């Protein structure tokens, strides 16, 4: 099916394979999800293309581990993923993303800025 | 509508989003769609959406793209041809089709 | 997909590798393919590959090519027409089709 | 032949009187027609005249328009894509289709 942003609460075998390709550095379980610690992913034609972790603390939220598969970059997958995470968490008034593990900070800033985030020391904010 | 391994697109000079024609050797159907990219190395040829009424998994198809150009250029034009066998193994690329003899 | 005696290609102004339409008078099927060359003098019209689902040996077909041009040129344009009988014997070439009268 | 809510034409960059292709997901038919405008906000997709042999009310279709451009421009071209659900509610517009992965 068309690109769709999903919240992952349970993982199929396929979700496990695709998440290995997105985040080869994580080996889950180790991916504990619950109401405040969420994984959102972008699904296209029955495969996960991208994912991000979200940590909710009421009106504050944090994003980490944002990655789009390199094969499908610059086709709007990351932008739609982040758009939909924000829209589905309307209670959050302040969002923060740390610059941790980011491979290319200058591409990340261009992206985050396109999404209305301001570059700050150590990450990007939208508050 | 048809996702195609990027290596196969490059071999034949087909672009993402380019109109293509598909001729199904297995069931004789002929349809026109557009190319989307599949992951390089995947060997995928995926017939998606409404086009999936026209092919099944395992069907042998011929995928073509057409361009326009002035008459003078068309007289010397050479197409980009790529030839497959087995499970989408690319065996040869070429720039001409031979002449059929009696 | 359709190999055609080179002498027939020249008569009608069709190029190797040019898109062509085939209209089958025998069985009514209409399909689009591209021309490949057959040996000059062979009289061959070979319908190959997936296209062979659409014609059989002995079928009588009409093969056409289409070009684009500006409106002003198209008003004076004359097509290249070649007429066959029997076993692909070329009987006439012409540059216009007459007007059909009541 | 196909009247389309003006808001949907604008979203996909389709013009009144532009040739369009319709691919019917429901019944597998593929046909080409031209766009006419329907009233903005009406959500209408009306298949009219001879085209109504090819779709019924309630059928899910994919409507596409194709343009031509030089090779160099086509390499960076981005299509205008709009995505629907339910009773023709527009859910998203985009400028690229993702890559299909294994």
């Amino acid at each position: 099916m068309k690109l769709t942003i999903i919240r992952l609460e349970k993982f199929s075998d396929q979700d496990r394979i695709d998440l290995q390709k997105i985040w080869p550095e994580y080996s889950p379980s180790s991916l504990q999800v619950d109401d405040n610690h969420r994984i959102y992913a972008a699904r296209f034609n029955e495969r996960l293309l991208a994912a991000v972790r979200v940590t909710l603390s009421g009106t504050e939220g944090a994003l980490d581990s944002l990655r789009v598969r390199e094969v499908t970059r610059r086709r709007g997958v990351g932008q739609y993923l982040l758009e939909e995470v924000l829209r589905n968490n309307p209670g959050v008034s302040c969002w923060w993303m740390a610059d941790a593990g980011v491979e290319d900070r200058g591409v990340m800033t261009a992206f985050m800025q396109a999404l209305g985030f301001t570059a700050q020391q150590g990450g990007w904010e939208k508050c | 509508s048809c996702a195609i391994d990027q290596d196969f697109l490059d071999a034949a000079g087909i672009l993402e989003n380019e109109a293509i024609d598909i001729w199904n050797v297995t069931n004789g159907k002929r349809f026109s769609v557009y190319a989307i990219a599949a992951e390089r190395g995947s060997r995928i040829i995926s017939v998606n959406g409404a086009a999936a009424h026209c092919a099944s998994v395992g069907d042998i198809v011929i995928i073509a793209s057409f361009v326009t150009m002035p008459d003078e250029e068309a007289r010397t034009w050479r197409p980009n041809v790529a030839y497959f066998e087995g499970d989408n193994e690319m065996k040869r690329t070429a720039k001409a089709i031979p002449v059929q003899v009696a | 997909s359709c190999a055609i005696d080179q002498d027939f290609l020249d008569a009608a102004g069709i190029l190797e590798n040019e898109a062509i339409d085939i209209w089958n008078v025998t069985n009514g099927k209409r399909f689009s393919v591209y021309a490949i060359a057959a040996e000059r003098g062979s009289r061959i019209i070979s319908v190959n590959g997936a296209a062979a689902h659409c014609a059989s040996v002995g079928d009588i077909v009409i093969i056409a090519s289409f070009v684009t041009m500006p409106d002003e040129e198209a008003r004076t344009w004359r097509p290249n027409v070649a007429y066959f009988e029997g076993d692909n014997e070329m009987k006439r070439t012409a540059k216009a089709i007459p007007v059909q009268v009541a | 032949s196909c009247a389309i809510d003006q808001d949907f034409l604008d979203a996909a960059g389709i013009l009144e009187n532009e040739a369009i292709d319709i691919w019917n997901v429901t019944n597998g038919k593929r046909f080409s027609v031209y766009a006419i405008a329907a009233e903005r906000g009406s959500r209408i997709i009306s298949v009219n005249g001879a085209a109504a042999h090819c779709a019924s009310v309630g059928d899910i279709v994919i409507i596409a328009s194709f343009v031509t451009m030089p090779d160099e421009e086509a390499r960076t071209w981005r299509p205008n894509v709009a995505y629907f659900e339910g009773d023709n509610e527009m859910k998203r517009t985009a400028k690229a289709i993702p890559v299909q992965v294994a």
């Binding site: 099916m1 | 034949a12 361009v67 041809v81 | 041009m69 | 994919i62």
Partner: peptide, 25 residues
């Protein structure tokens, strides 16, 4: 100023790996 339509390229005898009405498309 006559413009011709020419075969650009072709994939000869590839095999369909997947066919799904619900894939995009």
């Amino acid at each position: 100023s006559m413009i011709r339509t020419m075969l650009q390229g072709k994939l000869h005898r590839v095999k369909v790996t997947h066919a799904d009405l619900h894939y995009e498309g």
